């Protein structure tokens, strides 16, 4: 399913069809993207369960070599990093950075804290490690100077913001899908009816609430105007 | 009005506690 | 039973007979497929049970040889992937890929994560593997070079979308069925009354909700218009 | 009892006597056939119980030899299969394919997955096996080339759709019963009052619901028209 | 109003918890 | 309104859990 | 998501659109940050769990050498403190001070009470320490005199005030973001629907409460004016 | 309205469950 | 309306189950 | 309306069941 | 209306059963 | 209306029963 | 109307019984 | 009307009873 | 009217008693 | 009216208490 189908299901359940409606489809996109992460955490955080393939998305990143701090000699070895800021993954799925082929290569996505201290094991000196720095970029680290030649990776994970990771979606065979509404929403069908129910409950009450409608330099909500 | 962003999680937590109570009584016995 | 019977049963119970109705049969189709997936997971995920043949569905796939990353000498061995994107499966049944004869052939369908490290065992070197990659296609891998000659397979599983797998359904003896409404809905009849009840409950309240009827550059929902 | 008695009991409980009624007897047949399977699963799936003789039906099939895949030499041995698609059995009763005599012969109805691998035991090389393929036909398999001469079998099971298996009902001594209404409904009497109660509850609410009755290019259900 | 996509799941989960509690008491005895 | 395609199965499941709880206390004793 | 999206989502759900409204967006900002802290403590204080990177936030600190008490020969060794006051942290995550490279350096951030008795161990004499003193600044202490040369550090933590840490945020590659409304709100999307619900519940009742409208040298609230 | 073909069966099943629970506690003692 | 041909028997069955539960706890002890 | 020829008997039977449950716990102890 | 010639005795019987249950847990211990 | 010569006695008797249940659990332990 | 000369003492007695039940479970253990 | 000088004390006493019941279950175990 | 300076503390005390009851069942076992 | 800054915390605390009660029953058995 696509963003369009979910959005218009929510709108039609709410009957927000007129262009002169207070709650636009943008409210629907916001609520859908947040309630998706809410439901996924509620279902896949208590105890470890199988996560379907629908909850995931693949972003494609372009890597650039950057200094550790600045251009000094003693400031440590350089890191690669994605050109643009990367979405934050949830901790419920199977995050994986792969070199444009999911079935090959070993690039390990680890925590920020762990990546401070990796590769000291002599047999793990050739493994590329990944983490999202507080800067918001995906930083790469390894002890094997060959890693700095890496130019492109794809990252598959259950990203915490469907909109961000869908905007960073990888080019399809036909070409890029410009409109977000024509892209595919990241959620299993078994979680779609609950998601629609939660969003529709969220906006049902506000839909029929009064407005401060008189232009009279006055607050008109206490009078239910 | 209507909103279930706080009741849903409390119900889920209640059922999670029931889950843990149910699975905490599971024993693989001995002495056959 | 076909899509038509289920759709029109829901519509007739809602009495959405007038062509000038807000909720068309496409709303019904969307809700039916999403609640199908919801009910199947609710019933067959808690513990392992028997899945009847009625919740299963079949598709026809045409396989093409593709490079792992791109055409390069050192980018790894090639793969076989379906020409078109494959619907996501539900992890509740017996997914199976067979060479157009269900009672013959062993083409294993495994997890995408497992498919990286596979075939190293000396006796598992002639087994063909499958997994729906993040691209959306069903990639094939094996160590016995004969697999690349394979041209056409079938795939049976409890698919996440009944509509997507119905569009990719295998040709019948009579021929292809042009209308989705004339295809068999993939759910057991023991699960149909629950499904109809859930969908009718989904659309009962909205069926009688107010609309923003006036064309006056104003939101008329708070006034129950 | 027959389909007619159950149908008209439901109709008279609902008092849908006028020809100008929204809910026709076809709705009644649909609901009865689905709620039958619903009740049978609910009663005979929890723990194994005696199934009466009323829940069963005998279909008669005409078998034809078919290639495993196509007419190739190496495409495996041929199978027999029913000429027409066969109804899906429920997993609660005692399915049995018999050679027009229930008290004689051994044709084993097994699962689709099992029938891939049967007859390797040297003492089981003469046993005919059956299963419903994803094609929707009943396929036969054995290692004893005599089986391919088989021309007619009858299949007794608790079929998941009473309408389908009743349409495939075996010829009676008097002759075929053309109308489904004159055939015998497949359910024990102890499950008939619950079945009528469920169907009548299902259609009682919808019976008195409002309609979009004005032909005015407008949705008239919000106004309870 | 009405929509039972969250009530159904919570009732099903409650029944699953109660089923797990029931089956967790089952034992195959010994010492005959 | 009226529909029992979801309440009937939940009641049946509740009684099935009660069934399993009742029969899980059944013991054929020893030491006579 | 930014402060703007959250603020205007709360406002639009309350329909506080008129500029002549009692409750401005600053009420919303205050309530959002305080309920952010409330929810984070409620979720991540009972027992230890994983904190996502989204609840974390970063600041830039400039360090200046200061006397312990005042300039005297016997008042003890000097300290390094941030030029500006530092927001209080929440004791639920992984507070860390790093020298502008997260994956390098060991500047421990400890309790203020512990920081009195520290560094006596012979192998801990080159470790730099931190603690937010009662003055409000983040003081630094160590036994290796090189620490005083340190000039600039960063500090990652789950800060008590999102606004205070947002004002002290590190410069981005593009530059500084002048408006607080254009900065990223530090909360996981799984916690956003609860936060919006709590804040909307906070302001729903007051939104329709009576005001002392008359200018008559009298309290008009008992009369529901 | 009224029809008790499902209420009767559920009440009877509840009583059957409670009866099985009762009789499952019965023992014929030993060690005199 | 009024009819007790189904409630009377259910009440009687409930009290019979209570009867069997009460008398199933009766023990004639040993080891004096 | 009123007639208590079935309410009286059921209440009396309930009290009889509860009395039998009470007296079934009585024991005359040993090992002094 | 009013009459307590049947409720009084049932309440008294209920409290008598409670009396017997309370005094049936009384034990004069051993092994000091 | 009102008269509490039977309510008072029944409440007092209930409290007496509960007191006897409480004191019947008291023990002076051994094996130090 | 209002008077608490009978409800106060009954509440006090109820809490006294709860007091005695609570303090009757207090044990100073042995076998260390 | 309102006055909470007896409701407050009874609620506080109830909570004291429940606290004493809670702490009376505490043990410092042995046999390691 | 409204005031929670007495209900808040009673609720907090109730949850504190529940806290102490929950943590009083915690045991670090022996005999492995 | 409405404000759920104290209801939310009390419900969360109740669920925490119930979770601690659940996990406090967990054991890793021995004697195989």
Swiss-Prot record, chains A, C, D, G:
Coiled-coil features, chain-numbered ranges: none
GO cellular component, one term: virion component
Protein name: Ring protein 2
Localization annotation: Virion
Keyword Chaperone belongs to the record: no
Domain of life per record: Viruses
Presence of the UniProt keyword Coiled coil in the record: no
Species whose genome carries this gene: Bacteroides phage crAss001
Record keywords: Virion
More info: The barrel is composed of five stacked dodecameric ring structures. Podoviridae-like phages usually possess only one such ring. The tail is thus rather long.
Region of interest: Disordered: 206-225
Subunit architecture: Homododecamer.
Biological function: Forms the tail multi-ring barrel with ring protein 1, ring protein 3 and ring protein 4.
From Swiss-Prot, chains B, E, F, H, I, J, K, L, M, N, O, P:
Cellular localisation: Virion; Host membrane
Domain of life: Viruses
Signal peptide: none
Known role: Protein that is stored in high quantity in the viral capsid and may play a role during ejection.
Subunit text: Homododecamer. Interacts with the portal protein.
Name of the featured protein: Cargo protein 1
Complete-protein stretch covered: 214 to 245 of 842
